[PDB]
Write a protein that binds this ligand. Structure first.
Ligand code: NI
Ligand code: NI
Lengths: 240, 107, 237, 333, 108
């Protein structure tokens, strides 16, 4: 298992849940968003391999190839290296995709952008070959945007690493299916993006307050025999 | 902690019974970033003592009392070592904060 | 020998209270056993007498815990401290042992907390020239450094000397009294029996507020306050 | 342990239904009931039976409908009929749904239908949902009637709210208090104490009900339920509904906190009460900008805000007594 | 260094009652000292009234004024000569001039 480690130092998240009026945003980016971003990376890095009549089919085929080299439907995981918050925002979201109401119907709508100082992203692979290891490692970087085109994103470093079978608390995101055996945060994340599925995922986030403010610190969960070390500290992770 | 006594003196500049309404000195003492301007503002506030004395004397109620000389050196024995503006604000703002208290003066 | 009043000791005050209630029980026991049926507990007239005597023997015990006695030592002001607020903490702990039931102990603690001055909590007009508010009584109770030693055996010498059922006293601390009083207030304010709790608590409180006869009279219009103590003439001769 | 599970749909509506579960249990009994937050699920652990839960729920529905009949297709000026429902159709839809639930449950019959969810119970909902390349007609989101009624019971019984008319338009501020670590039944009931019915203020002097933070400060000023927020951590989720010219939309969804404001109020009112509420009310009525500066200082721990608020208040009509100043100084530390 | 109170005791006699000497201009000059030379000029102007107040203090049943000692003058000269910056000079000039307006119990 060649696990791809990257560091995303970007302030605001941009992925919203199934919502209207006020657009509720995910506390952590869902696997669908990261998968789409990596598919975009494959699109603009090697456009000869993925070529479609329309962008939808190119995105679908890039996603399919990524999932082909993925371990299973259980997709990329993340580790919040910074406290999380819900940062409210007001936007002039136009409404013209509905019946009638012409085409210029813009009204102010709220869409909060989750703020994050630092985050880490771990893709779980199944020992992809060397001639494509560089391909996907380069595809890990140049991840310019997440969510919509509003919130920019940037990488810090990219690497491949084994889990070295180390015991450590699970500081990643895992589905609430197998880790049930194990101050809990589980919610619908939509692991698989839709293109014309829904798994409950656990999060290492708690709403503890130290003096006055709450933010969202670490969860300090039970340790897991599978982990990975970055910048010295070791964080546990779940793999199938 | 020698705060009420000076607060009641600063209250003499805001109360309607003294129809002079010295509000600039309150802004000066409240908006103080370092040592010098806070002392300048407190001096400007204290300089109007004869104004208040003759205003209360000529109106009927007992004249206002000047802050005692016993805590005058107490003001400068602490503010000198508040080199950091962050902890200096805790007193600079509080000086004007106590300037708006009730402070019943004349019956 | 701790004294609840300025010049009256607790023992004599409680004796006068129970003596005053002695001539009233025949008038109020039938009226007080009826209202108990609507909350879910029923008991005989003797049990009602025992319950009311338990309330009488323990109605103001916070008056002697290192605070009220010190304030009432020579001239010290009360500073808006509600002693009776801790008394319920005893009652809820004591009545629970007396009747082996939860709701009767809860209502007894609530009613013994109800007298003196009520705590006005939940919505208010923009004026209050009193200390009835909870935001100040909680701060005052934050200074509750337990209770003086003599009280622990005092109740042991109180319930046993009158009737005698079972001696039991808790050990008050700073946090247990807060937890108990908040639980009592919450269970009184938000149990689905909304007005019924108020009605029954007032019905139980009416006999208890007859302490004017027991204590030293200080009201001019006491004739109206003594009309209820009067009863029908026994006979013409 | 019955340990009722709560449907995972929307952490606001999820909170409403899981947070009315407690009152449903209380009205049926169910001693020693607690709420464990699961991020959004908000599970509840208790030892109640399903039939007892149903009895409590029908008791709550009976009380709510009895309150609804007090005012009069029947439209009432209550919390769950027209006070909080900004849409006119819901004014009749909600009572019909509630009485349908009553009829179904009183006959020991589980509900077998689904109904539209209003924006009041969950602002994340609305009229349109982006599927792939557009929206869905009608209202795509639907909820089972049982959870719908439970969330309505919770909203009516627990969550405080404020309605300000000001002529043609209409503002509705809705506040829900969310625990973050753990709560027992007494804590949740203490929070329920905050709810007050018929907050339809209107008038013109009380024009400070705009600026949602100021409105919630004004509402919390006169509330003295329990200083639980100093020993337990709670957050507030609040939102505004506006009907400017029959254009129903939401313009504010900030997520503030309730511990700091309650701590400030308790510290200010611990010294003087007569000079506390009168002070705050006069400052709100006269110095609205000063009140905004004061609440900003409270939420941000800023020294200049208190001075600006006091100066603005003293400019027009505020006495600003000594004891509150001393309390502010003590808070400053 | 303790001489500020001593000099302010004498300065307070220039504005207090029971003296018939209302010299506020000298207080304003000694408090608005922008440079060392004008600060010293204001100090000299204030000290020039020492006989003025000392002679008449005994003529009205009051204790003689606490005229600053030459050690206070030496300390003031040492502080002035070491301050070439108006920054701390402003606060130094304010410090002693603030003692002028105080509730001194000069005459019992
Ligand atoms: Ni009494
Ligand atoms: Ni008594």
């Amino acid at each position: 298992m060649d696990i791809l480690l990257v560091c995303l130092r970007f302030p605001f998240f941009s992925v919203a849940k199934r919502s209207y009026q006020v657009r509720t945003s995910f506390l952590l980016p869902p696997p669908s968003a990261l998968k789409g971003a990596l598919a975009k990376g494959l699109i603009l890095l090697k456009p000869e391999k993925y070529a479609s009549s329309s962008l939808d089919e190119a995105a679908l085929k890039a996603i399919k190839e990524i999932e082909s080299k993925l371990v299973d439907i259980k997709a990329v995981s993340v580790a919040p290296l910074s406290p999380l918050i819900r940062n409210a925002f007001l936007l002039k979201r136009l409404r013209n995709l509905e019946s009638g109401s012409n085409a210029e119907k813009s009204d102010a709508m709220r869409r909060e952008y989750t703020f994050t100082r630092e985050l880490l992203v771990a893709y779980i692979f199944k020992n992809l070959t060397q001639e494509e290891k560089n391909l996907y490692l380069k595809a890990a970087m140049l991840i310019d945007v997440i969510g919509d085109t509003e919130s920019l994103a940037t990488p810090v470093w990219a690497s491949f690493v084994k889990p070295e079978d180390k015991k450590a608390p699970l500081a990643f995101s895992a589905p609430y299916t197998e880790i049930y055996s194990l101050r809990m945060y589980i919610e619908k994340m939509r692991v698989s993006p839709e293109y014309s599925q829904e798994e409950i995922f656990y999060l290492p986030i708690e709403e503890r307050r130290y003096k006055r403010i709450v933010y969202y610190a670490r969860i300090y969960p039970p340790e897991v025999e599978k982990a990975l070390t970055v910048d010295g500290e070791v964080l546990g992770i779940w793999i199938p | 902690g020698w705060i009420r006594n000076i607060g009641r003196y600063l209250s003499y500049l805001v109360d309607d019974t003294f129809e002079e309404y010295a509000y600039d000195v309150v802004d000066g003492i409240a908006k103080a970033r370092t040592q010098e301007e806070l002392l300048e503002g407190v001096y400007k506030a204290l300089r109007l003592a004869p104004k208040l004395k003759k205003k209360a004397e000529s109106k009927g109620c007992p004249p206002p009392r000047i802050p005692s000389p016993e805590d005058i050196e107490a003001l400068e024995e602490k503010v000198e070592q508040l080199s950091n503006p962050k902890d200096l604000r805790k007193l600079a703002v509080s000086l004007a904060l106590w300037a708006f208290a009730s402070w019943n003066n004349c019956p | 020998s701790c004294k609840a009043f300025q010049g009256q000791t607790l023992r004599e005050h409680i004796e006068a209270m129970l003596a005053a209630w002695e001539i009233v029980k025949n008038k109020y026991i039938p009226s007080i056993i009826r209202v108990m049926k609507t909350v879910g507990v029923k008991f005989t007239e003797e049990d009602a007498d025992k319950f009311m005597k338990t309330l009488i023997i323990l109605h103001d015990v916070g008056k002697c815990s290192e605070v009220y006695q010190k304030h009432l030592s020579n001239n010290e002001p009360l500073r808006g401290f509600r002693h009776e607020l801790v008394s319920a903490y005893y009652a809820y702990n004591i009545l629970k042992d007396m009747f082996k039931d939860e709701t009767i102990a809860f209502i007894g603690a609530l009613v013994v907390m109800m007298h003196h001055e009520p705590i006005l909590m939940g919505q208010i007009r923009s004026l209050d020239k009193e200390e009835l508010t909870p935001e100040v009584v909680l701060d005052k109770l934050r200074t509750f450094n337990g209770v003086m030693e003599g009280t622990e055996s005092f109740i042991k010498s109180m319930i046993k000397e009158k009737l005698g059922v079972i001696p039991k006293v808790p050990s008050p601390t700073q946090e247990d009294v807060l937890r108990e009083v908040i639980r009592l207030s919450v269970l009184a304010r938000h149990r689905p029996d909304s007005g019924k709790l108020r009605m029954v608590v007032g019905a139980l409180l009416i006999p208890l507020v007859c302490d004017y006869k027991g204590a030293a009279a200080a009201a001019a219009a006491a004739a109206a306050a003594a009309a209820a103590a009067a009863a029908a003439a026994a006979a013409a001769a | 342990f019955n340990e009722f599970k709560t449907p995972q749909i929307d952490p606001i509506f999820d909170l409403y239904v899981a947070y009315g579960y407690v009152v449903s249990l209380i009205r049926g009994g169910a001693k020693e009931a607690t709420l464990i937050p699961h991020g959004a699920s908000y599970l509840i652990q208790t030892d109640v039976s399903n039939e007892e839960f149903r009895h409590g729920l029908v008791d709550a529905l009976s009380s709510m409908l009895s309150l609804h009949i007090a005012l009069a297709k029947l439209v009432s000026d209550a919390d769950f009929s027209a006070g909080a429902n900004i849409n006119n159709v819901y004014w009749d839809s909600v009572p019909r749904n509630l009485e349908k639930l009553m009829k179904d449950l009183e006959k020991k019959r589980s509900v077998k239908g689904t109904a539209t969810i209003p924006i009041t119970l969950m602002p994340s909902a609305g009229k349109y949902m982006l599927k792939h390349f557009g929206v869905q007609g009608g209202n795509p989101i639907k909820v089972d009637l049982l959870n719908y009624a439970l969330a309505w019971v919770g909203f009516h019984y627990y969550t405080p709210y404020i309605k300000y008319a000001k002529g043609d338009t209409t503002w509705i501020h809705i506040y829900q208090i969310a625990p973050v670590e753990e709560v027992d039944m007494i804590s949740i009931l203490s929070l329920k104490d905050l709810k007050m019915h018929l907050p339809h203020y209107y008038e013109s002097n009380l024009d400070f009900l705009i600026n949602r933070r100021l409105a919630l400060l004004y509402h919390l000023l006169h509330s003295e339920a329990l200083e639980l927020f100093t020993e337990k951590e709670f957050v507030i989720h609040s939102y505004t509904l506006e009907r400017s010219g029959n254009n129903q939309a939401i313009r504010s969804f900030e997520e503030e906190e309730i511990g700091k404001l309650m701590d400030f109020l308790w510290k200010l009112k611990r010294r003087d009460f007569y000079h506390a509420i009168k002070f705050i009310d006069d400052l709100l009525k006269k110095a609205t900008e000063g009140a905004l500066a004061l609440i900003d200082a409270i939420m941000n721990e800023r020294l200049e805000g208190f001075y600006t608020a006091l100066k603005l208040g003293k400019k027009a009509g505020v006495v600003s007594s000594r004891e509150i100043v001393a309390a502010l100084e003590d808070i400053i530390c």
